[PDB]
Amino acid sequence: RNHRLLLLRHGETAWSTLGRHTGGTEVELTDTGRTQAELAGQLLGELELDDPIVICSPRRRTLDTAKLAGLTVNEVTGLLAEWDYGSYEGLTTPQIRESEPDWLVWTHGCPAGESVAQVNDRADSAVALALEHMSSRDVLFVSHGHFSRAVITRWVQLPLAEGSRFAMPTASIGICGFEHGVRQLAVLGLTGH
Amino acid sequence: RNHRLLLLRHGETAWSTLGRHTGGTEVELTDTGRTQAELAGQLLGELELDDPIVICSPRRRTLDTAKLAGLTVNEVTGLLAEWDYGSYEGLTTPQIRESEPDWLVWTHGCPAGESVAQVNDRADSAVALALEHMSSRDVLFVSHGHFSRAVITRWVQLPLAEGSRFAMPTASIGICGFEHGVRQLAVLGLTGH
């Protein structure tokens, strides 16, 4: 296709800096988070996007980022919500490690939350959504760390387990496109701050 | 580990702009290529690298890029040479398509040149090389499009066939590291021009 799928992770929060897993919890962006968002929109500005359709996660930290980035949101949907961490909500990876030493959200999932299968499907639906609009315009997802990686991993048609192989820091941008007929990851870890 | 593996593709040449596959052929950087290289070194400057060991491909376009980027090369080795295209040297993907409609270097390889297996092994040796120095410092490979992708694909422990899923434009930087014990791709398609 002649278009792209861009993904933007929301800025920093008090929880992200501590490595805490935040799903449905409504945490606010820090002042550093607001600045990150502001710089990202600055960066999106020179990406020369074609009449972009912006889809955003319902969380306030992502809605806030979109506004601060100077974007106008077209669709707000839980489809882009972060991985539901269930019982692990608020826990860091080490803390989770004290009980499940080999844990990775990518292979284990979360007890009382979303399983890999469920996110795999949610990720595919998201990619399907993107492809429909990319027929005429560029697409931008303002979402979260793990889910954004989920989308990317699926864009490149790999098992969701591979989400562990791609970073996605706060206020960072990843870009998906094509090369000689193949869906490909073009940019990752792009930061304007 | 506490260190990173960075990869830098050489700047633009008269052949790259045309989408021609260049392996052993000694093509020069265009003036645009020299500028790209110059900007990349500018970009490497703010990456705060730890006493970096720089390994470079023997081709003149890569040696030139390193010099223009303001880098001092520690090791020059064919280990980082581009995929040997054999019979396809000089051909574009469409041209190759006129004979092998479903061709991708990643799955087919090149007749009279390197096979996937051979590049898979060369890529792994390169990763092995990096890990040995990353024990005390950061590593920088100045190489080519397909091979750099090969190294990245292997860094993340995927079959070489997946090299098709990662872009690597001229004068672009990719960065490999770790996240909670897992080898991961941190940055891709980073451009200073």
Swiss-Prot record, chains A, B:
It catalyses: a phosphate monoester + H2O = an alcohol + phosphate; beta-D-fructose 1,6-bisphosphate + H2O = beta-D-fructose 6-phosphate + phosphate. GO terms for molecular function: acid phosphatase activity; fructose 1,6-bisphosphate 1-phosphatase activity; protein histidine phosphatase activity; protein homodimerization activity. Gene3D superfamilies: Phosphoglycerate mutase-like. The active site is at H10 (tele-phosphohistidine intermediate), E82 (proton donor/acceptor). SUPFAM superfamilies: Phosphoglycerate mutase-like. The record marks H144 as: Transition state stabilizer. The lineage of its organism: Bacteria, Bacillati, Actinomycetota, Actinomycetes, Mycobacteriales. Disruption phenotype: Cells lacking both glpX and gpm2 grow as well as wild-type on glucose, but are unable to grow on any of the gluconeogenic carbon sources tested (glycerol, acetate and butyrate); the growth defect on gluconeogenic carbon sources is fully complemented by restoring expression of either GlpX or Gpm2. This double mutant lacks detectable FBPase activity and accumulates FBP. It is also severely attenuated in a mouse model of infection, as it fails to replicate in mouse lungs during the first 10 days of infection and begins to die thereafter. Phosphatase with a broad specificity. Can dephosphorylate a variety of substrates including phosphorylated sugars like fructose-6-phosphate (F6P). Is able to function in vivo as a fructose-1,6-bisphosphatase (FBPase) and to maintain gluconeogenesis when the classical FBPase GlpX is absent. Shows negligible phosphoglycerate mutase activity. Has no phosphatase activity against 3-phosphoglycerate, 2,3-bisphosphoglycerate, or hydrophobic substrates such as alpha-napthyl phosphate. It is an enzyme of class 3 (hydrolase). SMART domains: PGAM. It comes from Mycobacterium tuberculosis (strain ATCC 25618 / H37Rv). One of its GO terms (biological process) is regulation of phosphorelay signal transduction system. This is Acid phosphatase. Optimum pH is 5.4 for phosphatase activity using pNPP as the substrate. Gluconeogenesis is critical to M.tuberculosis ability to establish infection and is necessary for its survival in the host. Pathway: Carbohydrate biosynthesis; gluconeogenesis. Homodimer.
